Amino acid sequence: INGEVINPIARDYPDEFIQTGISAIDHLNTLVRGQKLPVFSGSGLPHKELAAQIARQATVLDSSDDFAVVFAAIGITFEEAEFFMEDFRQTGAIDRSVMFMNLANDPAIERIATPRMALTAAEYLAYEKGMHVLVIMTDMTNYAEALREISAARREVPGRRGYPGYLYTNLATLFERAGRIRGLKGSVTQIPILTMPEDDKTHPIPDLTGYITEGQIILTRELYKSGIQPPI
Amino acid sequence: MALTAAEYLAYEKGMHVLVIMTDMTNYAEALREISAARREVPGRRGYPGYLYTNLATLFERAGRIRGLKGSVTQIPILTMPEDDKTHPIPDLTGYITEGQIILTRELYKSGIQPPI
Amino acid sequence: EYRTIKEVVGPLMAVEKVSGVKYEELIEVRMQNGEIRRGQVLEVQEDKAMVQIFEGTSGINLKNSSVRFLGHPLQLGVSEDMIGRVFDGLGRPKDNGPEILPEKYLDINGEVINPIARDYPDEFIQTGISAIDHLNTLVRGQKLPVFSGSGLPHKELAAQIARQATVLDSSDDFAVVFAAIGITFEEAEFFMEDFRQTGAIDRSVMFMNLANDPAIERIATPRMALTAAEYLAYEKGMHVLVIMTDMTNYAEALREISAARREVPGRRGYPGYLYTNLATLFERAGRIRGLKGSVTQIPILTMPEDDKTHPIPDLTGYITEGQIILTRELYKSGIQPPIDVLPSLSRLKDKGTGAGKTREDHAATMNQLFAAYAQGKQAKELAVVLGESALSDIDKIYAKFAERFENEYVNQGFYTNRTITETLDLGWELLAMLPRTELKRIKDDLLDKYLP
Amino acid sequence: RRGRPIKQKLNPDVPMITGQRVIDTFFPVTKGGAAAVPGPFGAGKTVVQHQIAKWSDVDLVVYVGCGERGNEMTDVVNEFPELIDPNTGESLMERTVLIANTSNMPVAAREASIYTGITIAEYFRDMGYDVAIMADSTSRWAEALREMSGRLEEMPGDEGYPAYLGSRLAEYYERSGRVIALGSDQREGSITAISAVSPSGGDISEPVTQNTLRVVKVFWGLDSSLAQKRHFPSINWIQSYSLYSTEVGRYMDQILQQDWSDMVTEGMRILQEEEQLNEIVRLVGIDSLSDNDRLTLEVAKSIREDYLQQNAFDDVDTFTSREKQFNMLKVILTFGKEARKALSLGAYFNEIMEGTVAVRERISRSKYIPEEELAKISSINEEIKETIQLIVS
Amino acid sequence: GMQIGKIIKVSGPLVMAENMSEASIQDMCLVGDLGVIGEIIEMRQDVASIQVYEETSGIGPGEPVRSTGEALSVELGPGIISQMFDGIQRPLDTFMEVTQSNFLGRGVQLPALDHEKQWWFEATIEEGTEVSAGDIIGYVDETKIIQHKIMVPNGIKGTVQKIESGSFTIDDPICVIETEQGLKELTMMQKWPVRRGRPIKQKLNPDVPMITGQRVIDTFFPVTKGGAAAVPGPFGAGKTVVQHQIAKWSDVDLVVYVGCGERGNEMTDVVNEFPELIDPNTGESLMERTVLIANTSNMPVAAREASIYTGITIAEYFRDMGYDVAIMADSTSRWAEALREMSGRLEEMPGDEGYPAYLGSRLAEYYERSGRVIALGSDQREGSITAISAVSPSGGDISEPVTQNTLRVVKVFWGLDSSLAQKRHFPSINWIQSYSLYSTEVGRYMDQILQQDWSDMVTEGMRILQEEEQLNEIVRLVGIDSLSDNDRLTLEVAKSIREDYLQQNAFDDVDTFTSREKQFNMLKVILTFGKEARKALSLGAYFNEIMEGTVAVRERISRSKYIPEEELAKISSINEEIKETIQLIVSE
Amino acid sequence: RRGRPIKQKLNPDVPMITGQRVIDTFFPVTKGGAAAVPGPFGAGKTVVQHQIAKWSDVDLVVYVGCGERGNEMTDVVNEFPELIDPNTGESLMERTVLIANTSNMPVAAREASIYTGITIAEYFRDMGYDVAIMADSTSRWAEALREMSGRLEEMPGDEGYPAYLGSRLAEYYERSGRVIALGSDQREGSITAISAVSPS
Amino acid sequence: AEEIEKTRRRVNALEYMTIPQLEETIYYIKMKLEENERAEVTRLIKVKNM
Numbered sequence A: 001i002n003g004e005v006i007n008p009i010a011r012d013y014p015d016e017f018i019q020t021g022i023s024a025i026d027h028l029n030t031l032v033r034g035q036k037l038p039v040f041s042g043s044g045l046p047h048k049e050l051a052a053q054i055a056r057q058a059t060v061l062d063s064s065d066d067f068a069v070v071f072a073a074i075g076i077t078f079e080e081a082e083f084f085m086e087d088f089r090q091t092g093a094i095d096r097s098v099m100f101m102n103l104a105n106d107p108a109i110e111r112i113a114t115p116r117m118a119l120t121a122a123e124y125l126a127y128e129k130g131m132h133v134l135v136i137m138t139d140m141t142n143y144a145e146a147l148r149e150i151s152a153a154r155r156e157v158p159g160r161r162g163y164p165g166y167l168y169t170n171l172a173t174l175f176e177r178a179g180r181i182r183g184l185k186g187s188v189t190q191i192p193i194l195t196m197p198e199d200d201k202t203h204p205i206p207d208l209t210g211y212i213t214e215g216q217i218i219l220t221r222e223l224y225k226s227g228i229q230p231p232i
Numbered sequence B: 001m002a003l004t005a006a007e008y009l010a011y012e013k014g015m016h017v018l019v020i021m022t023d024m025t026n027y028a029e030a031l032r033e034i035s036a037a038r039r040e041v042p043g044r045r046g047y048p049g050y051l052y053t054n055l056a057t058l059f060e061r062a063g064r065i066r067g068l069k070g071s072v073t074q075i076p077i078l079t080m081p082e083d084d085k086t087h088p089i090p091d092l093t094g095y096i097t098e099g100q101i102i103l104t105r106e107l108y109k110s111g112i113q114p115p116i
Numbered sequence C: 001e002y003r004t005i006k007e008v009v010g011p012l013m014a015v016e017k018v019s020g021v022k023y024e025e026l027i028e029v030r031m032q033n034g035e036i037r038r039g040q041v042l043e044v045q046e047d048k049a050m051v052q053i054f055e056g057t058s059g060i061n062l063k064n065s066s067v068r069f070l071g072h073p074l075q076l077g078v079s080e081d082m083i084g085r086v087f088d089g090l091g092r093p094k095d096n097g098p099e100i101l102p103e104k105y106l107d108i109n110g111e112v113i114n115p116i117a118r119d120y121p122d123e124f125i126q127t128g129i130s131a132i133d134h135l136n137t138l139v140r141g142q143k144l145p146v147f148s149g150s151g152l153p154h155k156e157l158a159a160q161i162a163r164q165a166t167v168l169d170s171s172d173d174f175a176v177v178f179a180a181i182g183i184t185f186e187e188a189e190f191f192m193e194d195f196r197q198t199g200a201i202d203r204s205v206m207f208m209n210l211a212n213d214p215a216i217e218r219i220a221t222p223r224m225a226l227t228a229a230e231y232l233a234y235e236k237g238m239h240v241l242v243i244m245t246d247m248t249n250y251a252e253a254l255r256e257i258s259a260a261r262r263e264v265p266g267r268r269g270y271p272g273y274l275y276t277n278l279a280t281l282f283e284r285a286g287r288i289r290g291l292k293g294s295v296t297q298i299p300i301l302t303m304p305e306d307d308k309t310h311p312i313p314d315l316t317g318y319i320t321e322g323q324i325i326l327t328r329e330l331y332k333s334g335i336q337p338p339i340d341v342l343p344s345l346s347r348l349k350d351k352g353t354g355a356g357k358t359r360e361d362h363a364a365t366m367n368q369l370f371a372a373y374a375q376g377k378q379a380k381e382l383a384v385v386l387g388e389s390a391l392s393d394i395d396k397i398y399a400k401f402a403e404r405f406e407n408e409y410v411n412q413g414f415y416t417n418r419t420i421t422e423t424l425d426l427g428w429e430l431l432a433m434l435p436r437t438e439l440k441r442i443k444d445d446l447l448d449k450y451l452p
Numbered sequence D: 001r002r003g004r005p006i007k008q009k010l011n012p013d014v015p016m017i018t019g020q021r022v023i024d025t026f027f028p029v030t031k032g033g034a035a036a037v038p039g040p041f042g043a044g045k046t047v048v049q050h051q052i053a054k055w056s057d058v059d060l061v062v063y064v065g066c067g068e069r070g071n072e073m074t075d076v077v078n079e080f081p082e083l084i085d086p087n088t089g090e091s092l093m094e095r096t097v098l099i100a101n102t103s104n105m106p107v108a109a110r111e112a113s114i115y116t117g118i119t120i121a122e123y124f125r126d127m128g129y130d131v132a133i134m135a136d137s138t139s140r141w142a143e144a145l146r147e148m149s150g151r152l153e154e155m156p157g158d159e160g161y162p163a164y165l166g167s168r169l170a171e172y173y174e175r176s177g178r179v180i181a182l183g184s185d186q187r188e189g190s191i192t193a194i195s196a197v198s199p200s201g202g203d204i205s206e207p208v209t210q211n212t213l214r215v216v217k218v219f220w221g222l223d224s225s226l227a228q229k230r231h232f233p234s235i236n237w238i239q240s241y242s243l244y245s246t247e248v249g250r251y252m253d254q255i256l257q258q259d260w261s262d263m264v265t266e267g268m269r270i271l272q273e274e275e276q277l278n279e280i281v282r283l284v285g286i287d288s289l290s291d292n293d294r295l296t297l298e299v300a301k302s303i304r305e306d307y308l309q310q311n312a313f314d315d316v317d318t319f320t321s322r323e324k325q326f327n328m329l330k331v332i333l334t335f336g337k338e339a340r341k342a343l344s345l346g347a348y349f350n351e352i353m354e355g356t357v358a359v360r361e362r363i364s365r366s367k368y369i370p371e372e373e374l375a376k377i378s379s380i381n382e383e384i385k386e387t388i389q390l391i392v393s
Numbered sequence E: 001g002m003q004i005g006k007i008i009k010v011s012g013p014l015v016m017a018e019n020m021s022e023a024s025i026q027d028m029c030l031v032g033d034l035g036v037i038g039e040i041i042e043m044r045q046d047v048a049s050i051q052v053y054e055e056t057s058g059i060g061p062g063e064p065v066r067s068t069g070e071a072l073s074v075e076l077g078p079g080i081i082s083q084m085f086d087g088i089q090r091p092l093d094t095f096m097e098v099t100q101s102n103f104l105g106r107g108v109q110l111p112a113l114d115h116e117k118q119w120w121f122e123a124t125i126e127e128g129t130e131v132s133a134g135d136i137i138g139y140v141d142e143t144k145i146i147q148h149k150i151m152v153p154n155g156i157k158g159t160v161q162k163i164e165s166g167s168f169t170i171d172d173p174i175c176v177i178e179t180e181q182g183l184k185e186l187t188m189m190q191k192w193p194v195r196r197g198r199p200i201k202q203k204l205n206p207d208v209p210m211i212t213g214q215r216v217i218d219t220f221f222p223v224t225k226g227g228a229a230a231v232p233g234p235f236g237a238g239k240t241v242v243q244h245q246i247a248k249w250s251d252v253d254l255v256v257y258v259g260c261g262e263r264g265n266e267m268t269d270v271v272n273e274f275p276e277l278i279d280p281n282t283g284e285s286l287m288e289r290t291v292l293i294a295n296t297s298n299m300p301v302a303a304r305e306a307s308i309y310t311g312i313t314i315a316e317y318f319r320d321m322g323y324d325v326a327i328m329a330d331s332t333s334r335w336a337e338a339l340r341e342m343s344g345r346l347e348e349m350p351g352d353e354g355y356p357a358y359l360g361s362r363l364a365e366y367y368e369r370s371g372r373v374i375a376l377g378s379d380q381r382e383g384s385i386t387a388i389s390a391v392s393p394s395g396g397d398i399s400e401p402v403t404q405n406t407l408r409v410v411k412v413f414w415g416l417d418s419s420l421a422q423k424r425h426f427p428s429i430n431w432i433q434s435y436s437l438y439s440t441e442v443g444r445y446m447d448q449i450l451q452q453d454w455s456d457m458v459t460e461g462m463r464i465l466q467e468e469e470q471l472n473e474i475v476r477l478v479g480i481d482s483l484s485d486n487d488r489l490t491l492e493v494a495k496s497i498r499e500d501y502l503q504q505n506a507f508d509d510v511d512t513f514t515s516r517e518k519q520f521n522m523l524k525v526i527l528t529f530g531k532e533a534r535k536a537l538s539l540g541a542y543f544n545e546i547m548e549g550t551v552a553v554r555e556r557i558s559r560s561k562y563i564p565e566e567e568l569a570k571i572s573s574i575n576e577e578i579k580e581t582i583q584l585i586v587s588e
Numbered sequence F: 001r002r003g004r005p006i007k008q009k010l011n012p013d014v015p016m017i018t019g020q021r022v023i024d025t026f027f028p029v030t031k032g033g034a035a036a037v038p039g040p041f042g043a044g045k046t047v048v049q050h051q052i053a054k055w056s057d058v059d060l061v062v063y064v065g066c067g068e069r070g071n072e073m074t075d076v077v078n079e080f081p082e083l084i085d086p087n088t089g090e091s092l093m094e095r096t097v098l099i100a101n102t103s104n105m106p107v108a109a110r111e112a113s114i115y116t117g118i119t120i121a122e123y124f125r126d127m128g129y130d131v132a133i134m135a136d137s138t139s140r141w142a143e144a145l146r147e148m149s150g151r152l153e154e155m156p157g158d159e160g161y162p163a164y165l166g167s168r169l170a171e172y173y174e175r176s177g178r179v180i181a182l183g184s185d186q187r188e189g190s191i192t193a194i195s196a197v198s199p200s
Numbered sequence G: 001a002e003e004i005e006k007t008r009r010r011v012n013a014l015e016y017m018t019i020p021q022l023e024e025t026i027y028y029i030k031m032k033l034e035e036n037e038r039a040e041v042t043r044l045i046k047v048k049n050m
């Protein structure tokens, strides 16, 4: 489930427009097939509803062959996991999807395994079966906290702000398992979702993620308190 | 020592006792000296992780008991380091005690007595 | 010679099965490939010695390398033949000059002057810069630093003082020791070319340490320079001016070395012993009772974020005897040098001014010029916030005074040398703008005699 | 330490009636939900939790005094038997279980009190009951873990807390919830978790609060500034949130047959607008404020003082029914709406305020109107519209 | 040939191995049976502590550790040009070809260069000649543009005994040297550790201006051959276009491009667009004289840290031949992120913002390796390395550690501005925030080579731009119609400098490059109009009369940038038209 | 390191005459009192303490140069003998004890100089004299403690200073004060502490 | 004239009081945050060796 690193010269450039059905994205911050475009959210912000909506509505114009969606839930509450599972079933989106559901009370080592299981499934469907795959993963912050737990068990001294020094390598290895590959029909598109602790964009988790991903969609409390849905 | 004397006079000798202890900050500093000497894993500001518990073992020694005539009323006094209420000493004390009376330099300089 | 290197962890190395090894003793590592690196004992315990290698431990094979303990700390081989010569941070020749034959070798830490043997700083050093010589006088034996910032012309000011500095009525006993610390090749080249072009090199000893040189060499640099200065001053009887830049690079190197040893960081990340460390440099300045000669220091530093409360200028100010401040406001006005005399101070200036040293009207005009300029600047700021009609007729005169003071007095150019006589006369010209009734800091005897 | 097994976990969609206006309206909790109340010392966290314990429509209350003051446990055993449900005749104590491990009682027993409480709640949940478990405070539980971690000399996480702190908290809250219990009957039961948190200095970025907010769904952030001006409950309406707002809004719309969701959205929007206006006023002054902005501040002031502020010690104000809540909020919004129209009709802010002193006093005292006399609140809407129209002409 | 170690502990990215006493500190190693990339960080007795820069999952005690017997090095010889490597010089093209996959398999070791390709070696030195490091014994015509010169390696000194032209691989002995240690054979390939600077005879001052052909740079913010420049790279500021312009138009012989640790899809763009760049002189691909380093964010942290070092070692190699090299790194912020990661993995005392305390030194080590030099050898030839480095802080703030330490050791700053890009001002270089500390020396050079007062013109040009900033504040407040005629004129001359000079279309066939001679003529006429019109104002003319009278000639000035290099008189003759037109205006 | 024993401390209620207007009028110190002088660099701390040394109505001055400039110690030895009392014809140096451990002298000896000084002050206090003890600067004493704390590998407290910083300072100042000294005489004496602080 | 003066006071309040107080506090907090981060890693290194 670790995968192999893609040769930087073997990657093909993102070309095809993905219609998420959300104006603030499609028009102003367009998602392109093969991109990694994350949502930066926060506690009490509706990234849950946005994740469900994107997975539900995302499509490529024409093509006929549609999106296979790999959905990874990392360290979330049962109530949130049940929302996702029930939304996927009630809309028929489950017929397009593969879901890997990990809960908050599951072991830290299972939370760490989850994104790797999901991305291994995605690369298999995409690069071996020729499918176009959209990968949505929440909450990446839960993944990072799981790393700290294992790191502390090995008595490793933390890096910046309490996280492992190798956090960058770790996040980069996950997020770069994406994109088109020259000569291959299928592709992987990633939408990682994370909550920014205390809504701080300089925090290691969103800060390093932005260095790796090609942009970010930001949700704010000001817009949400004003009733804007989605509060982008 | 003082609280053992107080609870004795109150609950075994039926007295109403008023306990005044100053400066509680000097107590916490002593705790930190021992904690540092033992090379214990430090908490905030070098203060031990058990500072709240330790302060609670003192301040909770107050009140009344059903069927007994006596009582223990406590007025601990502490100076807030750097006049900072969020410092571990006044912060944790505030989570334990039943309120607090705060004196400020601003009111003191304006001639307010007491500068509460 | 020991072949018992036991551990290497980063730049740190542990050598076992040793005897007679001392704290701070210099060591020599003969690598398996014949390469030679020097180091220093940081700590010695029983049969073990903890050493740090100046050039690092990259490429070292433990079992096939050997360590020699030299039996002495870091030293400088001193001679009077150092004048006119260029050395690196560790005192090695940098100018392709002839062989240097040392009279003796000296521990670069030097010794501490007995407080009772120390002589108070005394007598005038003419820098040729009006804002310094008159208002913030440099005295023989004084430590008087320049506080600057990134992009400010402290390197032009350093080179100007270095070639212009002199003592009056005393020939062939003045020398300059110039220490460059952690500076780039191109700024080193600026200094080298300027000294050679003006002939300042002929009375100077230069120690040139670069930005890509080992951090330990960068911190050895000022001690090499000061060791050379003390030898020339106290053993040869010379008046020596020591100019060192950039002290901010020195402190950064110190912090880098401190972090390598994983010491507990102090305020803003700098070592807890930053003050003490700076003091062991700056206190080598002074005079000694009964000895001819003196060491005078001008440390030059850039204030990070132009912040004077930053540990580097702050701790320096707690050590030195005043400070010369360069500002962007004056630099953007084209004032050369851009010295702001309002926050600048020399604490020992009294010992280098007056009759027999400069001239009898030195102190009075200084007090008056400073007072008039402060009032002039105050009136200028009043015109900014409330308008020109907010000033009285006298306030307008003082405002005009502060303009000419900056434009004609403080501003002289980086290649113009003013004698103290020229500086004092020029001060009287500016004072003449003001009504004689407003010159309240000067007694009538001085006014009647000098006022033009 | 073992969760009692269930058949099925369910979605908690039925809102809890706490009778506390700020909670039930803006940051509601459902039966089976989980809420945290993090606040600085002296912010009134105790009164908040006692109000919920005494007024919530659950069958049973498990109250856990975890590492807190002894007198608060004494207060509960004395007050609870005196609180009589008139529809029942039974006291609150006859539906309460108390677990007490005070701050000066053994430290390791703080963790035990937490687990003792949740297991008892699960036991009654399995019978088909709706249970609320109050943990005050979970910070003291976390500090017990930290002290033991330090004694084991483990590599600590932030602030000395063990790195597995988040996992421990997760195991507790995932035991709360609405379920179908084991048995042929397939009985439905639930556990609603209400936990106090005590962040040092009120800093919610500390590990206990942060790890808690990743697993709970309602955040009632207590505010020191509100507490100092005696604004109670001192819930920060800008910081706080409830993930149940949308679902509860749907439920309430259906119950009331009113656009309750819109009213709450509009109420919060006015409060958010006041916040943005105050950012300017503080660093500029109320000098250049237009009549519309001045009206916004007045409406927001009315929301704060006439609705959000609620005195737990007043016999009538201590509890507000859903219908009374609806009528109070309706009245407040109505004044804003009618005043807004008058401004567009050429009336001045100063005139509108001076001519509506009597009616705005009726709004300010709506909170004290008896539940049997709700017609005295609803009638205000007609006085607002009549009075303001008279000002226009 | 040294002892193979045995793993005794695997703990995350950290591996311990005994039997390592024959290895050295900083040695690169292959860890485990798979043989993944690692490095020796510590040594206690025979026990080495190793940082592993790939996944250690599946590795356990008992497995071998093999040292490579050297610190991270590069292969330097024929076959290096036109190739794309990663930070540790893995041949990315060869990896595709050999492994027949799109992945960089863990454990796969392939030589950086092609050791089987036949090259024609042409001998240029006679037998019996005394040689030392740097001396050229022959050359290989490696690409259609670049001639690869075969130099005597460092450490070798003696007499040439046998040498002749012929076909060889880079592993064949092409030369026999009689050294002190006896007869030794040389090949066309030499190795060099990336962290050690290649030795030179003497470092010189970089005082000759680079000709980039980009007007804002060459005129107002010039970099010299051997100089260094920092360039912030905010999104949508046209950074890559500026980079491409500099890479193909600058008068250097070779370009080394370094992608430090970039977003996967952004790195792909560079991989795509760079070979599509055409060499202006030959019409060949720019790759014919380019070496490119491409790291994505998921490359080993060692490759991301070594990126700029691997690149500058290669630059030094071609510099030693007597070539002028441009090393272009993007982004050095991502290089520093690798240093920050390593600092945490080594459990150091951190410097500012988590960066190592030696961040400043590492930057100084890199930039001081660029420069103009006298290379080793009896020729005493000159070469140079000019460094162009992108920085990209999180918020675009300069005061952060990476940009701040960089600006302490470089003398040129080109401040790309996204607000200027939004105003369609390209290239988006902020002429107020930017600077070049080479301006004064370049000015002396230019005045001499042009025999004109070029430096006076540049400073006057900047002065008008500086005054424009002040005047714009007044226009915003008071209004344009309330300015004096002199101020209205200054705004027009400043507008002409911005529009007719600073703004430059990289995609226009003529405007893409402006010769030094053409730049002079363009700035001359723009300033001459300002001079003549101001002389007209002081002779009694009105500002609007001057504007309304000079519509035709001002348009000639506006089209000056499109005048072909063969017809420079059509710009120069505008001067006479200005003086004549305004003369009639003063009359009428 | 051990305070010299006394009968009992007394309230310091008699103001010292420093002759410095701002001090005697608005911020007076009493005989047996203690005064802190914290300031930034270049604020005239040395002129202030020298003024107090030469003009205060005490029998003896103990002046401790703790971790500071050598020139300031040189200034004292040069100037103090020249300051002649008009009444008795004695110089200030004839009632002064000087202790000097400059900034570049051994760091641990900074702590030593502090205790050497206060103990000599207690000695003359025991004779029934009024003594002033000037410590410049106590910040450098604390730095010494911090250096040693690091060498001992102690857990750092506030700003890297050892956890016992506060109690060391408290113990020092509690050795100042007005006392009844030991002896059947029951004579009174005092130590007034004037300490510079140099906060970054 | 009165409106000009009332505007002037609001300008001076921001320029000489409000803004400098914000600038100095931001600088201070930023410094204090960094200090605590260093003290935290210092403790972790100590705990590590335990």
Ligand SMILES: [Cl-]
Pocket: C317, C318, C319, F040, F041, F042, F043, F045
């Ligand atoms: Cl001072």
